[PDB]
Amino acid sequence: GLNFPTYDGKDRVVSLTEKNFKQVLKKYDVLCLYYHESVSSDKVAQKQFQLKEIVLELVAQVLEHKDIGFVMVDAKKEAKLAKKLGFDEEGSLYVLKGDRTIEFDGEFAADVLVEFLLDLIEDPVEIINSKLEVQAFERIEDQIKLIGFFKSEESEYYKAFEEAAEHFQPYIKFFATFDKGVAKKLSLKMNEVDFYEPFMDEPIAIPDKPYTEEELVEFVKEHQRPTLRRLRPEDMFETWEDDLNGIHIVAFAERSDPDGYEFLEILKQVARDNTDNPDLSIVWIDPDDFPLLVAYWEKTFKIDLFKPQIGVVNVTDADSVWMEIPDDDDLPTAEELEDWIEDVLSGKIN
Amino acid sequence: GLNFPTYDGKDRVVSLTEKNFKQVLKKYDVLCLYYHESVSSDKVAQKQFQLKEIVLELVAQVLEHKDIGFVMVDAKKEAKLAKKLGFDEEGSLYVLKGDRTIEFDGEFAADVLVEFLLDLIEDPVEIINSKLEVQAFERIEDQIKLIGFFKSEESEYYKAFEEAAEHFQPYIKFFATFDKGVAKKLSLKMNEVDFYEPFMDEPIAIPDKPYTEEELVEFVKEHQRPTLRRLRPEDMFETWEDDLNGIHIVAFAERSDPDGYEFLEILKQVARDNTDNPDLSIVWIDPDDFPLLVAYWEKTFKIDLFKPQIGVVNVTDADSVWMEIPDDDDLPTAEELEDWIEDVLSGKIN
Numbered sequence A, B: 001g002l003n004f005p006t007y008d009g010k011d012r013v014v015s016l017t018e019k020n021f022k023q024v025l026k027k028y029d030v031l032c033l034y035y036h037e038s039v040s041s042d043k044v045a046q047k048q049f050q051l052k053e054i055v056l057e058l059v060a061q062v063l064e065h066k067d068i069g070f071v072m073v074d075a076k077k078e079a080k081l082a083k084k085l086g087f088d089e090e091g092s093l094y095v096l097k098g099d100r101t102i103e104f105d106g107e108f109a110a111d112v113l114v115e116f117l118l119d120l121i122e123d124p125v126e127i128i129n130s131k132l133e134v135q136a137f138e139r140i141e142d143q144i145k146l147i148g149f150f151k152s153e154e155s156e157y158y159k160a161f162e163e164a165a166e167h168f169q170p171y172i173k174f175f176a177t178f179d180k181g182v183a184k185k186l187s188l189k190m191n192e193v194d195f196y197e198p199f200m201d202e203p204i205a206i207p208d209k210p211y212t213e214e215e216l217v218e219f220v221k222e223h224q225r226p227t228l229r230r231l232r233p234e235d236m237f238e239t240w241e242d243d244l245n246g247i248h249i250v251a252f253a254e255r256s257d258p259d260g261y262e263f264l265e266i267l268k269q270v271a272r273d274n275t276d277n278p279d280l281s282i283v284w285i286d287p288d289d290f291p292l293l294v295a296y297w298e299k300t301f302k303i304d305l306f307k308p309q310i311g312v313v314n315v316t317d318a319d320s321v322w323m324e325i326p327d328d329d330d331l332p333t334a335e336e337l338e339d340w341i342e343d344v345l346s347g348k349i350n
Helices: A021-025 A043-062 A110-120 A131-139 A158-166 A180-185 A213-222 A236-241 A258-273 A291-301 A334-342 B018-025 B047-065 B079-085 B110-118 B131-139 B156-167 B180-186 B213-223 B236-241 B258-276 B291-300 B334-345
Strands: A030-036 A068-074 A093-096 A125-128 A145-149 A173-177 A193-196 A228-230 A247-252 A282-285 A309-314 A320-323 B014-016 B030-036 B068-074 B092-097 B100-104 B125-127 B145-148 B173-176 B193-196 B228-230 B247-252 B282-285 B309-314 B320-322
Touching (some): A030 A043, A030 A110, A043 A068, A043 B047, A093 A110, A125 A158, A158 A173, A193 A213, A228 A258, A247 A258, A258 A282, A291 B047, B125 B156, B131 B180, B156 B173, B228 B258
Parallel strands (some): A030 A068, A145 A173, B014 B068, B125 B173, B145 B173
Antiparallel strands (some): B309 B320
C-alpha cells in the first residue's frame, strides 16, 4: 500500500526542448531546471551526472504533487533555448517562480532540495498573530530574519516589504504582523522593520521608516554578512564564495559535545563584541551536519574535528593556519580569541 | 567539477566473484556487500539499483581512507558465494565484520551509511575508565545500553560480553568498566551487567550473575523490544517490520517544537507505567528526522505533523487511525493517554 519514498525507478525529470518548452513552462507553477552538458561515455562524467540525475528523480517523487517541475537542459544540444532562458554556466540548478530565478547553491542532496523547494513554494512573508507564532519566530537564531509591523495585508508599506522579501527567498526570513499586541511585545512601531542578525540578541532597526522596496532591499544587501554565520546546507556554496578578504576564518564546534557547545557560547561573545567590524566574519561548521566532508576537512586541514577548532583558511591556494594552540591545548575565551583573530595578519601579510 | 568535494565519478565498488573472493576477504576489515537481483530485464528497476549503486559509490569514496571494502555480489552470476556468504534476500546490503554478518535495514542514504559503517569499524565495547566519563554514559536516553563491571579485559567475563556485543552492533550500545569507583556509581557488583531500556528510570539487572555470551544474547533478545522506541534512519525498516500484532502505535512529536517536547515527556511517562504491557510498543517518529517521509505522509497522512499526535497505523491493511477529532491543541494528560491506548490495544481501536 506504497509506504516510504524509496525511489520508484520511474522517469519524472524530462528534458526541455523548444518542442515542449511552451507547454512545460505553462503547466507548472515552480519549475526547477538543471542546466548541464554530459561528455560522451566518459564513464566518470556519466557517473558524475548519474548522481545528480537520481537526486532529481527522488526530489521529483517526493514532491510529485505539490507542482514544481523538474527538467533537464543540455549545453551542446538545446544551447540557444538556454541562453533564451538566462543560463550562464554549466552545472547549475535554477528554479523559476515569482518570476525570478533563484540560483540554488547548496548541497546536491534530495533532503536539502526538498526543503529548499518546499520554501520557495510558500509565499515570501510569514505573518504572526499568536503566542506560539511570536514564540516560534523568537526561536530562530541562526538565520537572518526581518520582521515588520503593518496596518493591513493591504498596507502599501506592507506590500513594499513583501516585494523586498522576494529578492531574498528562501535564504532570508521576512515576517509581518498586524496585531497590535504582538508588536508591543516584539517592540515594533507602525511600518517599522527590525533586522535580526544571527546569534546577536538585539535587532537593529532599519532606519527612517516607512520604507521603500528598494530601501529595504539595499539594507538587507548591506547587512547580509553576519559576524558569525553557520555553514548551512541550503546555501553552503554561496557562503563558501562570500570571501571576507581572500580568506575565511573558519571555526568548528559540535553544539552537543560540551567542549563544542561551550566553545560556541564564547564564539557568539566575540561575535557580539566585534559586530561593527567589517573584516571579521566567522563561519561555524557544526561537524555533525557534514559527515562526508568531516573526513575530508579533518585530513586536508591537520586538525581533529571531533574537538573544537578555529583557524584561517584561504579559499584559493588551499592551505590553512589553524589555531591549533599548537600542542592541542584546552582553552579559549573571548579576550584570547579576539586577540588571535585580531592577529591573523601576523599569521599572514607582514 | 570544482567545489569542496562532490563525487568524482570514479569506480570503487567492485564486483565479487570466487575468482577474487579470497583476495578481497583477506584484504579488508569490514566488507560491505550489496546482494542484488540481476542486470536490466525491465529498465525502471535498473533505475532503483542505480540509486543503490550511486550511493555505494559515494559512501566508498568518502570512506576510502577506511578499512572497509565495497563490493557487489550478484545473485545470478555468483550463487556459490552468496550461499557460502549466506545471502538469500536479494536487494540487501550486508556487512561482514569477523565471523558476524550484519544486515543494513535502514534508510539507504550515503550519510546514514557513512554513520553506520564508521560505528561498525569501531570496537564494540566502549570502556568507561572514570566517573567523568560516567556522566556522559548517562547522556543516552533513547537507546538500549548495557554496562558491565568486570575485573579487566583479560577476564573470561569481559571476553564473553565483548562477544555478546558483536551480535548486536551498531544498534545496541555496550559499555564496560573495570574501575571500582565507576562501578559503585553505576551500582554494579563484580561481573554484573545492566540493561537500560529506552526512556525508563532504572535498569533491569541481567539476573544470574555471571554470564556467558549466549546467556547475554538471550537476555537482550528477550528484552530488546522497548515500549517507547525511537524511529531512527539506521534501522527504520527493521523497526517497521517488527509489528505489535499487525499494528503500530505511531507517535509524532518534534522534540524542539516545545509542545512536541512536552507531549514527548508525557509519552515517556505513560510508557514508563505501561512498560509491563507486552503488546504495547509506541514508535515515536521525530518528524524533523524524516523529511522526504513527512512529504509522503503529507499525502496519505492528512494529519498535521508540526503538531503532536499518536495513532494506529496498520501495517497489514495500509490504513491508519489517529487521536481524536475532537482532540485539538489541548495537549493530553498522561492519564488521558493511557486511556486512549487501552481500547485500541486491547479492544477495537475506534
